[PDB]
Amino acid sequence: LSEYGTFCDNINSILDEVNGLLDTTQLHVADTLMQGVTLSSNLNTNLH
Amino acid sequence: AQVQIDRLINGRLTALNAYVSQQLSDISLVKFGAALAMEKVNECVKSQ
């Protein structure tokens, strides 16, 4: 397998970049959900 | 020498197929990004 070792390096690198894209996408979705959100400190969902 | 060279041809042709597949996927992402940039030019720069 060491003669083909570049194939395993490319497979690992592509999966790592794909997972980095999923992490970056999840952060962007969370940022979109949190953008411009302002809450009262007095807000208690147990009563309200 | 034909047997040894055929092993190298298979490896190098597999390498090109893998690179070509990655390039097709990356250009699809670039086309999506370029459409977004054109939409941002039209809806944020030339108008609001």
Query: What distance lies between CA B31 and its chain's CA centroid?
Result: 10
| Distances in whole angstroms, Cα of residue B33 to Cα of each of A3, A15, A28, B36, B39 | 37, 21, 15, 5, 10
A14 touches chain B (CB under 8 A): yes
Instruction: Return the ∠ at Cα A14 (arms to A19 and A21), rounded to 5°.
Output: 30
CA A32 and chain centroid, separation: 13
Phi-psi region of A36 (alpha: psi -120 to 50; beta: other; left: phi over 0): left
- What residues in B contact A7, CB-CB < 8 Å? 14, 18
Is residue B18 within a helix (H) or strand (E), and if so which, with residue range?
helix B2-40
Which of the 8 DSSP states describes residue A45? T
Among A4, A7, A14, the residue with its CB nearest the CB of B22 is A14
Q: How far apart are CA A28 and CA A20, in angstroms?
A: 12
Tell me whether residues B18 and A10 touch, CB distance under 8 A: yes
- The CA distance from A36 to B18, in Å, is 43
Way the structure was solved: cryo-EM
Question: What is the stated resolution of the deposited model, in angstroms?
Answer: 2.6
Q: In this structure, are residues B44 and A37 in contact, taking their beta carbons and an 8 Å threshold?
A: no
